[PDB]
Ligand binder design. Structure first.
Ligand SMILES: Nc1ncnc2c1ncn2[C@@H]1O[C@H](COP(=O)(O)OP(=O)(O)NP(=O)(O)O)[C@@H](O)[C@H]1O
Ligand SMILES: [Mn+2]
Ligand SMILES: [Mn+2]
Length: 337
């Protein structure tokens, strides 16, 4: 009852060349060298790219795998070195349409800004019109709180409690968040605000590798107010070993179910097809009042901690994308639901 296989498309991996750009920290966390070993066994060449060096000489490349997210974010902040790297990368990609990029920079850029990403998820969900899915109201606050803040929140469907997150979606200075419970709590901007959804303190990290995904359960904020706003760093909340009073559920309340694979599949397809990403995660929580799936976070090329099949899935996705290119499997028109 696994019906999709890759043995045949894996036969074309021989002689293919894969370039990757990952930070040394990410190479370590992934044990990416072990993936490189796996590919060599199928007759692939894998090489780490150096974006300080002309890229022509480093190719030909059939595929590039990267996580340039933070270099892009630095280049956005006018870091001269990062700009140089991105320009070089971009020049090369532009010159080599035959090179499959996992994932395209336009796709990456969508996930760099929380508000933009949440709006894309909202639009995608409106298009899918599945009553099993909900988009928590969200908005971006740019001005410091004041006399009009309450009415601004209200007209955008923001309610207490809501969680405050940075607009920048990754890197240094992206993990500090707040939960605001009442009007007095409104000193906690700029930031994105998103209605807090009680979900019985279980996060379902959907780790997507192209055509396959793995769901990994993580600790998550408890259910919840004259109380002081809560400030926390998301590093401390939803890691495998995370444990704190913020994630200790008092008791199961309301609807408590696991996510629907049918729903995850439709979300995965729609996000992949609309945005062009393939190596990403979406964080799903199950609303305890409605049972609906809420996507509260989307991340380009995350850690995949707990995804033991990550390497074989990655290899299968490289085989698939090569198969797609070889047979001109380009999508046309709108996302086909
Ligand atoms: N709208 C929400 N309702 C309820 N809980 C939430 C909501 N948004 C975030 N959380 C919780 O807060 C945690 C951190 O929020 P998240 O937006 O995933 O941060 P992040 O820094 O982008 N995490 P990650 O990229 O997965 O390392 C989540 O794992 C949930 O436990
Ligand atoms: Mn998250
Ligand atoms: Mn995130």
């Amino acid at each position: 009852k696994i019906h999709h296989h890759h043995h045949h498309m894996q036969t074309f991996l021989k002689g293919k060349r894969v370039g990757y750009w990952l930070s040394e920290k990410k190479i370590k966390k992934l044990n990416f060298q072990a993936f490189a070993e796996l590919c060599r066994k199928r007759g692939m060449e894998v090489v780490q790219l150096n974006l300080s060096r002309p890229i022509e000489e480093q190719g030909p490349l059939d595929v590039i795998i990267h996580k340039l997210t933070d270099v892009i974010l630095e280049a956005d902040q006018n870091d001269s070195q990062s700009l140089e790297l991105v320009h070089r990368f971009q020049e090369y990609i532009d010159a080599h349409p035959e090179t499959i990029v996992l994932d395209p920079l336009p796709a990456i850029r969508t996930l760099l800004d929380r508000s933009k990403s949440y709006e894309l998820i909202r639009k995608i969900e409106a298009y899918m019109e599945d009553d099993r899915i909900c988009s928590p109201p969200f908005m971006e606050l740019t001005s410091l709180c004041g006399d009009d803040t309450m009415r601004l929140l209200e007209k955008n469907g923001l309610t207490f409690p809501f969680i405050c997150k940075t607009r920048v979606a990754h890197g240094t200075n992206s993990h500090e968040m707040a939960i605001v419970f009442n009007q007095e709590g409104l000193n906690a901007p700029p930031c994105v605000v998103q209605n807090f959804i009680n979900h019985n303190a279980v996060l379902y990290k959907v780790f997507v590798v192209g055509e396959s995904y793995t769901v990994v359960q993580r600790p998550s904020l408890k259910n919840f107010s004259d109380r002081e706003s809560i400030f926390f760093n998301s590093h401390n909340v939803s890691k495998p070993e995370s444990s704190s009073v913020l994630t200790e559920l008092d008791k199961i309340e309301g609807v408590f179910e696991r996510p629907s694979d049918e729903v995850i599949r439709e979300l995965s397809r729609a996000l992949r097809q609309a945005l062009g990403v393939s190596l990403f995660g979406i964080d799903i929580i199950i609303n305890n009042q409605t049972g609906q799936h809420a996507v509260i976070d989307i991340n380009a090329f995350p850690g995949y901690e707990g995804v033991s099949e990550f390497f074989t899935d990655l290899l299968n996705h490289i085989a698939t994308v090569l198969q797609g290119q070889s047979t001109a499997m380009a999508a046309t028109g709108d996302v086909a639901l």
